[PDB]
Amino acid sequence: MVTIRLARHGAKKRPFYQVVVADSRNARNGRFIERVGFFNPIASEKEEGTRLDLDRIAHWVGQGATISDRVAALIKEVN
Amino acid sequence: ARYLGPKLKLSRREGTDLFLKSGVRAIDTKCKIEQAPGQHGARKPRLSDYGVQLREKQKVRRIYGVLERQFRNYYKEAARLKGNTGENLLALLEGRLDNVVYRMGFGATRAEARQLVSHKAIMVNGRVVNIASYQVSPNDVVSIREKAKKQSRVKAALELAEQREKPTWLEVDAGKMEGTFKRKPERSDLSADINEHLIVELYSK
Amino acid sequence: ANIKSAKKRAIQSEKARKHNASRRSMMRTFIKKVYAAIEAGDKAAAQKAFNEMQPIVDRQAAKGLIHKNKAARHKANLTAQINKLA
Amino acid sequence: KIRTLQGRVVSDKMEKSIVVAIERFVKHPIYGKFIKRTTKLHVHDENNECGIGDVVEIRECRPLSKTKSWTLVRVVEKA
RNA sequence: AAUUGAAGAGUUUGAUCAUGGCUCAGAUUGAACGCUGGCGGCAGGCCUAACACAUGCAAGUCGAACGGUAACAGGAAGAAGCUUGCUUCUUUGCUGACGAGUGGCGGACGGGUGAGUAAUGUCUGGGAAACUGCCUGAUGGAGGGGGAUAACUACUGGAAACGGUAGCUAAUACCGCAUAACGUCGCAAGACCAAAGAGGGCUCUUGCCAUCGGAUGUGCCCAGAUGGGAUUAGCUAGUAGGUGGGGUAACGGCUCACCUAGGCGACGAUCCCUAGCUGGUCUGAGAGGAUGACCAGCCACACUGGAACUGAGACACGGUCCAGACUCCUACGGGAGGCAGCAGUGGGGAAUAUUGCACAAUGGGCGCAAGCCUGAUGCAGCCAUGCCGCGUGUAUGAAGAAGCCCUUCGGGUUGUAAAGUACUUUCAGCGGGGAGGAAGGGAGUAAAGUUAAUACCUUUGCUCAUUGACGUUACCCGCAGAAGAAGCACCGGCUAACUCCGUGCCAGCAGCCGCGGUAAUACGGAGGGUGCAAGCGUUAAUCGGAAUUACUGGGCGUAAAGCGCACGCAGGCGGUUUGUUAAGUCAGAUGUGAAAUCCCCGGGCUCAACCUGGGAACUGCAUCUGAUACUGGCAAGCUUGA
RNA sequence: GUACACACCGCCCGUCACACCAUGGGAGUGGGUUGCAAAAGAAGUAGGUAGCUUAACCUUCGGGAGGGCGCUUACCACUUUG
Ligand SMILES: [K+]
Ligand SMILES: [K+]
Ligand SMILES: [K+]
Ligand SMILES: [K+]
Ligand SMILES: [K+]
Ligand SMILES: [K+]
Ligand SMILES: [K+]
Ligand SMILES: [K+]
Ligand SMILES: [K+]
Ligand SMILES: [K+]
Ligand SMILES: [K+]
Ligand SMILES: [K+]
Ligand SMILES: [Mg+2]
Ligand SMILES: [Mg+2]
Ligand SMILES: [Mg+2]
Ligand SMILES: [Mg+2]
Ligand SMILES: [Mg+2]
Ligand SMILES: [Mg+2]
Ligand SMILES: [Mg+2]
Ligand SMILES: [Mg+2]
Ligand SMILES: [Mg+2]
Ligand SMILES: [Mg+2]
Ligand SMILES: [Mg+2]
Ligand SMILES: [Mg+2]
Ligand SMILES: [Mg+2]
Ligand SMILES: [Mg+2]
Ligand SMILES: [Mg+2]
Ligand SMILES: [Mg+2]
Ligand SMILES: [Mg+2]
Ligand SMILES: [Mg+2]
Ligand SMILES: [Mg+2]
Ligand SMILES: [Mg+2]
Ligand SMILES: [Mg+2]
Ligand SMILES: [Mg+2]
Ligand SMILES: [Mg+2]
Ligand SMILES: [Mg+2]
Ligand SMILES: [Mg+2]
């Protein structure tokens, strides 16, 4: 089904995650429907580690999109 | 990745002092600056337009101790940067941590400044930077490490710097052995001997 | 088959094939009866056959042997032909 | 409105079908000269109204045959 | 703010100008080879045989669907050597669990490759006749029965693979019946169609069926675009259209019968050759040209040819059936197999890596969950293959030392170069410290919700242990000592850099022009020099320079080039005025133009490469609303062309 | 005037002879690909039904319906011929 999950970009040993809405069947870094935010695990202080479009996420949840565990944790920490 | 050969030969080829020695003694006493190096150095062959352009580029490289690949990248950056490419190029070379350390008087020569930077004796904004090519922004503070403050070389270099003309764009405090890069040097601040237009033309060849 | 689930799948698909074919054959037999009655030209016989067929096509659609659209087509096609027979 | 094309009938021989030529003026990609280009469409004509040389308006529809996905709207001009 | 953009040279002649080809300087690469080689970061790495493949691994999971109990780990009970209260030995699915089996879901994803395909592909823009597991909204239902079957047991056929016969048994397996309408068929009246339980403590949770929605995915249609060849010009009978029947989820010659004779093509049909397409990439001032490796989208393929079955979805890489070539097993009757998953082997080749580690993170399958599976992925190994960073010391040092080379023997040069002297310790080495990638999950604890219930379950705080493959991590600190760290091409002109000796049209060099026959800056060595530098050269290949296919941006009296002349269809183009239209054109708006990339302004790794936020751009296409000069259409003229 | 420039003792054309290289024709010969006209018919699917057989439904308990197997036909891969 439609899911909200983290696509792993960035460089080796320095992960950067794009938060995307995707058909779950597609590859992690493959075809996605929409980008709704990002998560930087190693973001420096004074730099925004996580940004999420809650309105777009909420819209997709309304349409029955599931949320990955990590994205759910990120939503909690954001709000 | 660095030139380790005799320094004065480079100045002799260029025909001008490249400040590759401390300047404690005159270059003329140290070498025959006028004569080009080697057996046929006394002969002065006519130089082609390409030759003139090449020699200007080599001079600037030899002054700052930059190899061709890095120098080419500087040119490309200067051309990309808005404004005068030739002026941008000289500004980039001036912004190098290596050059800044020498101009602040912490190093007697750019090579000496290089060793200081490389050997982690230099801090920028209170953080240790050991990269010669590091670009210093305006309002950055360059200071010697407390451990390295005791070094005799640094004190000697400061004395030599007093003899030399003081850069307007750099504010340096001796004893404290810290300096501030107030602004990027203007073309007027740099020597008019260098003809940057020849370098820009050469890279358009 | 190299993989265990594939081996099991082959057995289950074969069992499913036999079950489906039997139902598919039966459904077609009843549909053929309606067409035969229409060919005969007996409206009453055609309607009687149609009435026996209708529950079968509907149920098989529900079972997923055929699509509901296919069941609808069979009913629609036959109804039109029987009405013309009148 | 409904998207329509206007063209000249070039064949009316088929039963309930016509071949219509649509003219398009296109700038040449390299040379930049405006050139006339022709597209021929098989069109459904229920009443066989249209005749060769007629100017007609046609609209896109569901496939009606192997080569027909357009239908006649009106006959703008008779030959 | 998203810009800033454009170099020539050599060579035809006795000399000249022009023309014109050839050649060179640049940038680039999945490179290869030769010589050389310190370190790190990031990335890349079978371009050839879509050749053949040893071995291991790449798809399972669910006991909260089911009969069970092969294990093991207990328990209980009963016997026991009798620790005289444990131990041993049996029985008992009794329980934690759990082999094999039934059933569910997954196996159509993820991963590989580019053979085929010049369009049943791709790209852009539209469109109608569809279906869509899991997810999600709404409204209802969820009654009552039946016949089986695997496992198992007995027997039995085979060398094996794989079976056969009989008996027994369960379900969320299977099949009636009831129920039946915002469902299906029907003008209507009517007719017809489903379901499944399981778990926790009556209640809660979850599952099941029906219909209608959404979302996602997918099928289908149209227009434009998308290689080369005319020394391929005609092609086509399901062909093109119609009518009716059948078929599909769905429109449709999709199929068939009948009818009509169409349909396509110089705006290149058909045939031949080549080729996966795109975002992009390289080059270029641009316009172009070339290209499609990595990354992402789409397509196609899975030993070869063919076929269906199951399923929401496949005509299915690690499924089924058939045929074939290959390899293999065999008791000769008959069997088995498919690395273009990862690693690896042989082979081919100028040439391309380890039979590594881990599921810690991200993501995927199954599961209530714990978890299990995951060669996806994260990492590590190998390789200067590329990009980027850094080091190989640094000041002082005339004795202008030796030694070399050159020399008119005065000297000059190597060269401040080396010694010598004074310092520094990056990196490498040794030692000691030490982030972050970790979110969650598990126990408890309280409140709230729920309910008959302070139960259970859910939610949210709370508390306590705990989860890192990389890993001897990044990073930091200390120690010792210049120690452990420079090569490659070139020096006649183009083209930066010159002499001596050897050789004597030889040996050899060579991109072009050329060089070599005894005073060679051109061969070979040496001294010196130039350019690059952990690389440097050479070869291959693309674009550039080439305005040398010229759209931007060229020519045709004599350099290559006006058809021998003319008429003329198609085509291109067309005097002047008014009105009208608004097609071109222009303006604005809207939708779309995937993300990445490129560009601009920023942020993060000590810098950079690299990573990343936002913007700009995507020059296009469609639609809507306007403008009407020009062009086109239409109407009416006009007289100057005819 | 010139096609000469160590400059008419200049320049320069073709056959013939010898060597070598690429290429056309050539009795034909051997491969690849492919058109046309036929032959062929594994498996599968669909249509039909000599026969054989059959859990669930129906039944008057005899059977019936329906199903399966077999057989047959159509389509078609291998393959074959001109
Ligand atoms: K299973
Ligand atoms: K030329
Ligand atoms: K291909
Ligand atoms: K057809
Ligand atoms: K038809
Ligand atoms: K392109
Ligand atoms: K194939
Ligand atoms: K399914
Ligand atoms: K994992
Ligand atoms: K032109
Ligand atoms: K007009
Ligand atoms: K010959
Ligand atoms: Mg480097
Ligand atoms: Mg089990
Ligand atoms: Mg069921
Ligand atoms: Mg019923
Ligand atoms: Mg190919
Ligand atoms: Mg150009
Ligand atoms: Mg099916
Ligand atoms: Mg498979
Ligand atoms: Mg395989
Ligand atoms: Mg492999
Ligand atoms: Mg080999
Ligand atoms: Mg496994
Ligand atoms: Mg020169
Ligand atoms: Mg000599
Ligand atoms: Mg080249
Ligand atoms: Mg060109
Ligand atoms: Mg010309
Ligand atoms: Mg002539
Ligand atoms: Mg001529
Ligand atoms: Mg003439
Ligand atoms: Mg318009
Ligand atoms: Mg984009
Ligand atoms: Mg007009
Ligand atoms: Mg021949
Ligand atoms: Mg057959």
Domains of chain B: 7-93+190-204 (1.10.1050.10), 94-180 (3.10.290.10)
Q: Which helix (H) or strand (E) holds C36?
A: helix C4-40
CA of B42 to C1' of E205 (A): 100
CA A37, A41, A46, A47 torsion-angle sign: negative
Give CA–CA dist B99/A26, Å, rounded.
Answer: 52
**In the block, which residue shows the tokens 């080599």?**
B58
Task: Give the nucleotide at minimum CA-to-C1' distance from B204.
Answer: E7
Residue D28, Cα to own-chain centre: how many angstroms?
A: 23
Contact B154, B177 (CB under 8 A): yes
- Distances, alpha carbon B117 to alpha carbons B62, B156, C70, in Å: 18, 17, 82
Q: B125's torsion region: left (phi>0), alpha (psi -120 to 50) or beta?
A: left
Domains contained in chain D, number: 1
Task: Give the nucleotide at minimum CA-to-C1' distance from A35.
Answer: E595
Which residue is closest to E184 in terms of CA–C1' distance?
A: C72
Nearest to A7 by CA among A31, A28, A37, A32: A28
CB neighbours (10 Å) of residue B126? Answer: 7
Task: Give the nucleotide at minimum CA-to-C1' distance from C19.
Answer: E174
Domain hosting D23: range is 3-79
Q: Which helix (H) or strand (E) holds A2?
A: strand A2-11
Give CA–CA dist C6/C13, Å, rounded.
Answer: 10
Which residue is closest to E39 in terms of CA–C1' distance?
A: B1
Identity at C51, one-letter amino acid code: N
CA of A25 to C1' of E259 (A): 52
Contact A24, A60 (CB under 8 A): no
CA of B44 to C1' of E420 (A): 35
Contact C3, C23 (CB under 8 A): no
Q: Where are the domains of chain C?
A: 1-86
* % helix, strand, coil for chain B, step of 5: 45, 10, 45
Give CA–CA dist B158/B179, Å, rounded.
Answer: 12
Distance A68 CA to ligand 28 centre (A): 56
CA of C68 to C1' of E560 (A): 77
Distance D34 CA to ligand 34 centre (A): 31
Task: Give the nucleotide at minimum CA-to-C1' distance from C26.
Answer: F66
Buried b (16+ CB within 10 A) or exposed e, A5-21: bbbeeeeeeeebbbbbb
> What is the token pair recorded at D69?
């996905």
Distance C1 CA to ligand 14 centre (A): 21
Name every residue whose Cβ is closer than 8 Å to that of residue D75 and which is 6 or more positions away in sequence.
Answer: D49, D50, D54, D55, D56
Contact D20, D9 (CB under 8 A): yes
Nearest to B102 by CA among B116, B90, B88, B91: B116
> What is the token pair recorded at A1?
């089904």
Give CA–CA dist D5/D27, Å, rounded.
Answer: 19
CA atoms within a 13 Å half-sphere pointing along the CA-CB vector of B19: 19
Give CA–CA dist B102/B111, Å, rounded.
Answer: 9
Q: Which residues touch strand F (CB under 7 A)?
A: C 17-19, 21-22, 24-26, 28-30, 32-33
Buried b (16+ CB within 10 A) or exposed e, B88-117: bbbbbbbbbbbbbbbbbbbbbbbbbbbebb
Identity at A50, one-letter amino acid code: T
Distance D62 CA to ligand 7 centre (A): 34
Beta strand segments in C34-79, E:
none
> What is the token pair recorded at D12?
């009316």
Distance D31 CA to ligand 29 centre (A): 21
Residues B126/B129/B133/B134 CA torsion (nearest 10 deg): -40
Task: Give the nucleotide at minimum CA-to-C1' distance from B7.
Answer: E416
**Which chain F positions have some atom within 7 A of a protein CB?**
45-48, 56, 66-68
DSSP assignment of B6-51 equals -HHHHHHHHTS----S-SSS-HHHHS-SSSPSSTTSSS-----HHH
**In the block, which residue shows the tokens 């912004």?**
B95
**Which chains does B contact via 3+ CB–CB distances below 8 A?**
none
CA of A6 to C1' of E76 (A): 53
Nearest to B160 by CA among B116, B117, B108, B112: B108
Length of chain A: 79
Task: Give the nucleotide at minimum CA-to-C1' distance from C32.
Answer: F47
Give CA–CA dist B166/B177, Å, rounded.
Answer: 15
Contact A8, A28 (CB under 8 A): yes
Beta strand segments in D1-79, E:
4-11, 17-27, 34-44, 55-60, 68-77
> What is the token pair recorded at B174?
């001796």
CA of B109 to C1' of E43 (A): 37
CB neighbours (10 Å) of residue B166? Answer: 12
Which residue is closest to E130 in terms of CA–C1' distance?
A: C69
CA B108, B109, B110, B111 torsion-angle sign: negative
Ligand showing the shortest atom-to-Cα distance for residue A28: 9
Resolution (A): 1.9
Name every residue whose Cβ is closer than 8 Å to that of residue D32 and which is 6 or more positions away in sequence.
Answer: none
Identity at B150, one-letter amino acid code: K
**Which chains does C contact via 3+ CB–CB distances below 8 A?**
none
Name every residue whose Cβ is closer than 8 Å to that of residue D37 and which is 6 or more positions away in sequence.
Answer: D23, D24, D25, D26
Distance D77 CA to ligand 19 centre (A): 53
Give CA–CA dist C33/C22, Å, rounded.
Answer: 17
Nearest to B106 by CA among B136, B143, B140, B141: B143
